Structure 1
Amino acid sequence: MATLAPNRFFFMSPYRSFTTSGCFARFDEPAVNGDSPDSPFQQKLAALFADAKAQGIKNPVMVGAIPFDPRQPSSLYIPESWQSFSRQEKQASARRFTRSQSLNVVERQAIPEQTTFEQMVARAAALTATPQVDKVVLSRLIDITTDAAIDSGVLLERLIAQNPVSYNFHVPLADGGVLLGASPELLLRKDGERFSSIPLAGSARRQPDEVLDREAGNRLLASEKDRHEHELVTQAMKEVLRERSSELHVPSSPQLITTPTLWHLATPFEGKANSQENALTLACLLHPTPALSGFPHQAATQVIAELEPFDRELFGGIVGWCDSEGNGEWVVTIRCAKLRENQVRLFAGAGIVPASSPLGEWRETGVKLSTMLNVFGLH
């Protein structure tokens, strides 16, 4: 009953699921202007890829995470090797994994707490009613200190068991840490010439019984707050993708998708892109989406910087991989945690427009945090 070592990358996806071994070269280069092959980011990336193939490695991948603010340094690296696994096989082994960790929390801190958060929500809702911004997303944290170092392998087993369907990731950080999570949001898949993105925005709690549950979702489909929330996201990426895609299909209405925790509204984007493009050039172009920063992007970037009493770092960024041949997959870094020794930080954001109530968003972010609290066996 072996668990994953904290110095391995792991990625579980309906596209490609693999683990990695060892480390060839680290890659800290900021991803800013990564949507443009003339960028130092892409150049150094290309260099490092040719460097790696010249050095003997067949089929190099670049795995890891990129922070919310792409000016900041990146958590990417080429492993020595990688090894495919069966997503379904893994779901099954995880569900049978029995041996846990007795873990006692010695501190639990909400940052910020209910009252401050509600004022941040009120002050942001009001700025979206004005001409300055239409949508800002605001987040909060839960910091947890435990009395023994947290085994990240056992926790990954639990996360998979509780979240069989999501993009489940486990990434080694340059400090000795681990970024760990169960993301439902595809930011960018590129499979040959073909690409897709599946933005989410708008949520409703799921219910214990499949009658009051199957309508909670129907209600989400009707909800105008959430539908407007959602529309703000899709129009933005349409425009951005306009002169970057050969062809492009986007439904004008969202569809329901599930989390063990949440109903969300989704819009799948499908398209083809030029050979001038790769998984990262496209992922950099799209992220962050109005689902994670706001609209307009840079104007919401500033509200966020003045309201949030912390730095997001890797939270609200993207995690995934890309190869030397333009392929890859990138998911949004949400429903996640950073672990290092006996310290964990959880993250969740919403979801703010003129029609949002501060209690509403506080409790929403609450349900989103519970994906990762459940992995820890907390409430």
Structure 2
Amino acid sequence: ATLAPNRFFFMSPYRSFTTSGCFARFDEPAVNGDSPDSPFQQKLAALFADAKAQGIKNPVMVGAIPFDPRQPSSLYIPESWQSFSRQEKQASARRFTRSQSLNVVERQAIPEQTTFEQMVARAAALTATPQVDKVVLSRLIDITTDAAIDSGVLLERLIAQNPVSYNFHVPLADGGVLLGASPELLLRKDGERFSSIPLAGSARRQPDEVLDREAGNRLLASEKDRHEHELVTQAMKEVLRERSSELHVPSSPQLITTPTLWHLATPFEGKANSQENALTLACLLHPTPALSGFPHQAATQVIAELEPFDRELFGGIVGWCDSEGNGEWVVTIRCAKLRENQVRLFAGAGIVPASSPLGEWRETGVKLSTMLNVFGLH
């Protein structure tokens, strides 16, 4: 049995659930969604009361928000939801046997290696200057297949290969499915308590648990990545100052893993005002310098002049919140948009003065391989 493409699914060490039905869609842009006087929040709160009044106990709001919060949002309240056991689902997925044979008929890197290296070069150059210190640049892989892609079977494969990550499956207004295995927590809020766990900095994992246990330790030392990382953490520090009652931040990062990568992480733990819910804080933080750059608005402008595509939901956030200030939001990376027989993958890095284009090209390549492995490609 597999999940139908019109259900939301979210797999997390916090709350893991599915959803059924669609009481109300919510397209409203999330810009200035960090202040509760915002159209986004007033509309959001309007719709929650609408839902409760109309008979829905414990409404939740689910879906994704795009990189650029001006662009519209892909949220909606389901008619219902249904908790499930993370560990139970890991085990069923690892046994899910029957897969789909897929024939690719086109595969396009957008852009290809050379154009990407020139974009990495022209971006690193501009970080050396007073104009920006960090920009994140991304690329895509477009895949056309000869038959519609079964979203449910693919999701089982993704769980089996990515047991530990924040795994999501989002129905879109166009009939598509946004799907991925994010390692990066952008914002959890459990009652009054909140955390965020930004990543930045990467190294390949190795098959041998000797060269693996040390390729990591290298990551912990590499000044390139340690500096990559500090830009993200200083910025999130400043932004949370007058938004959080308390706030604890380690000054040095720690190692975490995906099946493909070592990453550097810094956990944030704080308490926030009753003025705040899961999305006001998520909208505040996102995008961090791990997904856009630093300074944030200066780096969006390099991204627009350099990236030959619209990121749309990629590099956004995906998740949920309820009517009572709680929720979880993870960054939309290690992901794909599926629709009928067409798929788009996404990956970004991670660009400062010391970054070589061959390095970042291959870094994004390893990140893309999470979703390529789900598809059975290299």
Using the size of structure 2 for normalisation, the TM-score is 1.00
Question: 1 CA distance for matches of 2:72 and 2:60?
Answer: 19
Question: 1 CA distance for matches of 2:90 and 2:35?
Answer: 37
Question: 1 CA distance for matches of 2:19 and 2:360?
Answer: 37
Residue 178 of structure 2: SS of its match in structure 1? strand
Question: 2 CA distance for matches of 1:152 and 1:122?
Answer: 37
Give 1:323 shift.
Answer: 0.2
Give 1:276 shift.
Answer: 0.1
Give 1:232 shift.
Answer: 0.3
RMSD of aligned residue pairs (Cα, Å): 0.2
Question: 2 CA distance for matches of 1:73 and 1:219?
Answer: 41
Residue 97 of structure 2: SS of its match in structure 1? coil
Write the deviation string for residues 126-176 of structure 1: whole angstroms up to 9, x where unpaired. 000000000000000000000000000000000000000000000000001
Residue 301 of structure 1: SS of its match in structure 2? helix
Give 1:182 shift.
Answer: 0.1
Question: 2 CA distance for matches of 1:74 and 1:120?
Answer: 29
Q: Which structure 2 residue ranges, 5 or more long, are not aligned? A: none
Give 1:186 shift.
Answer: 0.0
Residue 256 of structure 1: SS of its match in structure 2? strand
Write the deviation string for residues 212-252 of structure 1: whole angstroms up to 9, x where unpaired. 00000000000000000000000000000000000000000
Give 1:3 shift.
Answer: 0.1
Give 1:356 shift.
Answer: 0.1
Write the deviation string for residues 347-378 of structure 1: whole angstroms up to 9, x where unpaired. 00000000000000000000000000000000
Question: 2 CA distance for matches of 1:291 and 1:37?
Answer: 25
Write the deviation string for residues 68-114 of structure 1: whole angstroms up to 9, x where unpaired. 00000000000000000000000000000000001000000000000
Write the deviation string for residues 269-324 of structure 1: whole angstroms up to 9, x where unpaired. 00000000000000000000000000000000000000000000000000000000
Moved over 3 A (4+): none
Question: 2 CA distance for matches of 1:5 and 1:316?
Answer: 25
Residue 101 of structure 1: SS of its match in structure 2? coil
Question: 1 CA distance for matches of 2:223 and 2:273?
Answer: 36
Question: 2 CA distance for matches of 1:31 and 1:378?
Answer: 35
Question: 2 CA distance for matches of 1:37 and 1:219?
Answer: 43
Please name the residue that 1:50 is paired with: 49
Write the deviation string for residues 335-355 of structure 1: whole angstroms up to 9, x where unpaired. 000000000000000000000
Write the deviation string for residues 31-86 of structure 1: whole angstroms up to 9, x where unpaired. 00000000000000000000000000000000000000000000000000000000
Using the size of structure 1 for normalisation, the TM-score is 1.00
Residue 315 of structure 2: SS of its match in structure 1? coil
Give 1:185 shift.
Answer: 0.1
Question: 1 CA distance for matches of 2:260 and 2:124?
Answer: 25
Question: 2 CA distance for matches of 1:164 and 1:230?
Answer: 25
Question: 1 CA distance for matches of 2:195 and 2:342?
Answer: 36
Question: 2 CA distance for matches of 1:91 and 1:43?
Answer: 38
Give 1:190 shift.
Answer: 0.1
Question: 2 CA distance for matches of 1:325 and 1:134?
Answer: 38
For 1:30-109, list aligned pairs within 5 A: 30-109=29-108
Please name the residue that 2:24 is paired with: 25
Give 1:183 shift.
Answer: 0.1
Question: 2 CA distance for matches of 1:75 and 1:183?
Answer: 18
Residue 68 of structure 2: SS of its match in structure 1? coil
Question: 2 CA distance for matches of 1:220 and 1:36?
Answer: 37
Write the deviation string for residues 4-44 of structure 1: whole angstroms up to 9, x where unpaired. 00000000000000000000000000000000000000000
Give 1:259 shift.
Answer: 0.2
Give 1:187 shift.
Answer: 0.0
Question: 2 CA distance for matches of 1:62 and 1:161?
Answer: 27
For 1:305-316, list aligned pairs within 5 A: 305-316=304-315
Residue 211 of structure 2: SS of its match in structure 1? coil
Please name the residue that 1:366 is paired with: 365
Please name the residue that 1:144 is paired with: 143
Q: Which structure 1 residue ranges, 5 or more long, are not aligned? A: none
Question: 1 CA distance for matches of 2:28 and 2:80?
Answer: 21
